[PDB]
DNA sequence: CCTGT
DNA sequence: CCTGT
C-alpha cells in the first residue's frame with residue numbers, strides 16, 4: 001500500500017494533467033461534499049462544465065467555497081489541475097488564513113498515459129497540446145512544492161502507485 | 172519558515188553526503204540521546220570513528236540500538252549518510268516491526284557545498300571522490316523514497332532551506 | 343484544462 | 348562515509 005497521512009484540517013490539492021485521473025481518484029477516496037471541482041464550478045456559473053471562457057468566474061466561486069469550508073474546519077479536496085504556480089498560490093494563502101494544512105497530491109504519470117486515457121474518454125476530450133503542456137507544468141512544479149507552503153507533499157509515480165493509495169486521516 | 176511535521180514516535184532518517192551537515196543538523200534539532208550516529212558506532216566497536224573496515228559491526232550496533240529505542244517508543248534519528256537503498260531498507264523494516272513512522276529528511280545540496288565544507292573540516296575529512304559518489308547516490312534516491320516506505324519525505328534544497336527548518340512534533 | 347494554432 | 352573495481 002501507499003499510505004498518505006493527512007490531518008483533519010487539510011486542504012488537499014490534487015496536481016495533475018487533464019487525463020491523469022484526478023476526478024476518479026477524488027471520488028474513490030473522498031465523499032462528494034469534500035470535493036470541490038473547478039469543472040463543476042464552470043457548470044455552476046455557466047451551465048457548461050467545459051466552458052473555458054468562464055474560468056475566471058469558476059475559480060472565484062471555487063476559492064469562495066474553499067474559504068467557507070476551511071473557516072468551518074472542514075477537510076476539502078481541490079479537484080483542478082493545479083499545475084500552474086499561480087493556481088496553487090491562492091489555495092495556500094486561503095489555507096493559511098484559516099490555519100489549515102495544505103497537502104499536495106501529485107499525479108506524476110507519463111504524458112503517454114494521460115494522452116491514452118484522454119483518447120478513450122466518452123466525455124470531454126482535450127487536444128493533445130493541452131496534456132503535453134499540463135504534464136510539463138506538473139513535472140516542473142514538483143521540486144518547489146514544499147517551499148510553496150505544502151506541509152505534506154505526496155508524489156504518485158505510476159498507475160500502480162495511484163491504485164495503492166490509502167489516506168490515513170489522523171484525528 | 173520550513174515546518175516539518177513528525178509524529179512523536181518517528182524514525183527520522185537523515186539522507187545526505189558527507190559534508191552535507193547531517194550531524195550539525197541532528198545536534199540542533201534533537202536530544203543527544205535521540206541521535207544515533209554511525210560514526211559514533213564505529214567508535215563504540217573499534218575506538219576509531221573513521222575506521223571504514225568496521226562498518227559492518229558499527230551498523231549492526233546502530234540497528235540494535237534503534238530496535239531497542241523503538242521497542243520502548245522513543246523517537247530516534249539515524250545520523251548516517253543513508254544514500255544507498257540497501258542502507259535504508261533495514262531501517263524501514265525496524266520501524267515496521269515496531270509500528271513506527273519512518274521519516275526521510277534529505278539534504279539535497281550541491282556537491283560543491285559539501286566539497287567546500289569537507290575541505291574546511293578540522294576533525295576528519297573524506298576524499299573528493301567519496302562526496303562525488305554520495306551526492307550522485309543522494310540525487311538518485313529522492314524519487315523512490317515514498318515508495319520505499321517513508322511516510323513523510325522532506326527534501327531540503329539549499330543551505331537556506333536547511334537553516335529555516337523547524338520540526339513540529341505532534342503528540 | 344486557469345482559455346492554441 | 349555502508350569500505351572506488
Ligand SMILES: Nc1nc2c(ncn2[C@@H]2O[C@H](COP(=O)(O)OP(=O)(O)O)[C@@H](O)[C@H]2O)c(=O)[nH]1
Pocket residue numbers: 016017018019020021022023024025117118120121122159162
Ligand atoms: N485505467 C485507468 N483509467 C482511469 C483511472 N482513473 C481515471 N481513468 C480514466 O481516465 C479518464 C479521465 O479520468 P478523470 O478522473 O476524469 O481524469 P481528470 O481529467 O484528471 O479529472 C476517464 O475515462 C477515466 O475512467 C485509473 O486509475 N486507471
Ligand SMILES: Nc1nc2c(ncn2[C@@H]2O[C@H](COP(=O)(O)OP(=O)(O)O)[C@@H](O)[C@H]2O)c(=O)[nH]1
Pocket residue numbers: 187188189190191192193194195196288289291292293330333334
Ligand atoms: N556554513 C555552514 N556550515 C556547516 C553547516 N552545517 C555543517 N557545517 C560545517 O560543515 C562541516 C561538516 O558538517 P557535519 O555536520 O559534520 O556534516 P556531515 O558530514 O554530513 O555529518 C562541519 O565542519 C560543519 O561545521 C551549516 O548549516 N552552515
Ligand SMILES: [Mg+2]
Pocket residue numbers: 022023024039079
Ligand atoms: Mg476532472
Ligand SMILES: [Mg+2]
Pocket residue numbers: 193194195210250
Ligand atoms: Mg556526521
